[PDB]
Amino acid sequence: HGQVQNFTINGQYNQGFILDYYYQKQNTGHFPNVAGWYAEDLDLGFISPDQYTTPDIVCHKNAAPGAISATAAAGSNIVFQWGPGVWPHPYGPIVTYVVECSGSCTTVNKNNLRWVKIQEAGINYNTQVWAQQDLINQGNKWTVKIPSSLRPGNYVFRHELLAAHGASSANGMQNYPQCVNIAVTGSGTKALPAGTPATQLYKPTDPGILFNPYTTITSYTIPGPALW
Numbered sequence: 661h662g663q664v665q666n667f668t669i670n671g672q673y674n675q676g677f678i679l680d681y682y683y684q685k686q687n688t689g690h691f692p693n694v695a696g697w698y699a700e701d702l703d704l705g706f707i708s709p710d711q712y713t714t715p716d717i718v719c720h721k722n723a724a725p726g727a728i729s730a731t732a733a734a735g736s737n738i739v740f741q742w743g744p745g746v747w748p749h750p751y752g753p754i755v756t757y758v759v760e761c762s763g764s765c766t767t768v769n770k771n772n773l774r775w776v777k778i779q780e781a782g783i784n785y786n787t788q789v790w791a792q793q794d795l796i797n798q799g800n801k802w803t804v805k806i807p808s809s810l811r812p813g814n815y816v817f818r819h820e821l822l823a824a825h826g827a828s829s830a831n832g833m834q835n836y837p838q839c840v841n842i843a844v845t846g847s848g849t850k851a852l853p854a855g856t857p858a859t860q861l862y863k864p865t866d867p868g869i870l871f872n873p874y875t876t877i878t879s880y881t882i883p884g885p886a887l888w
């Protein structure tokens with residue numbers, strides 16, 4: 661359990677969506693305009709395999725686009741900061757996707773977004789240590805590079821932890837997707853390819869979704885489509 665509360669682009673601070681804003685909205689009808697998506701999981705919980713074909717897998721529970729967008733040059737590093745507490749969950753991979761928006765991302769139909777994998781990290785076979793343990797050891801921070809070749813445009817980045825402590829059972833994998841609006845500028849010239857609807861990323865029986873984390877692992881298939 662946890663959420664992306666803020667993030668940096670080339671060191672520069674950007675405000676993310678925090679749970680306090682959900683309660684602001686309940687009380688007053690409005691909340692601060694931020695690049696992180698609004699979402700309604702009040703515990704900072706997860707989406708389950710039985711929800712892999714539902715709108716909630718796109719950007720988490722009842723999610724809606726942030727009212728503004730951040731911005732970054734292609735080749736920039738994003739550092740997602742998870743919180744408010746230390747990440748609980750030392751087992752599992754970390755993946756990040758990007759999708760382009762037709763028009764502003766602030767008003768996009770999330771269900772029409774098509775995702776391209778730009779980062780993935782699993783288990784180090786020699787240490788048996790997962791990417792999520794590395795996240796805990798890096799102060800809840802994860803670095804993702806925006807591909808240098810990516811052409812300017814309005815994009816959404818979908819950063820996701822797949823906590824695998826329960827993955828040996830059907831429906832046990834816990835997905836924590838978090839979306840942020842980040843427009844891209846600069847000197848990249850390549851269009852994003854066709855990509856994959858979020859509802860087609862994962863199946864409950866995929867080899868890296870349903871597996872035993874409590875035994876020595878010599879081969880692991882990180883879930884989702886191929887790295888771009």
Ligand SMILES: *[C@@H]1O[C@H](CO)[C@@H](O[C@@H]2O[C@H](CO)[C@@H](O)[C@H](O)[C@H]2NC(C)=O)[C@H](O)[C@H]1NC(C)=O
Nearest residue numbers: 664665666667741742743744745746747799800
């Ligand atoms: C960016 O988000 C992080 C992560 O939640 C915030 O860091 C937390 O800050 C609180 C309040 O000071 C501390 O009690 C926690 O220990 C921190 N958690 C972690 C994991 O670092 C940080 O405050 C946010 N930045 C801003 C400016 O709001």
Ligand code: NI
Nearest residue numbers: 661662748749
């Ligand atoms: Ni949790």
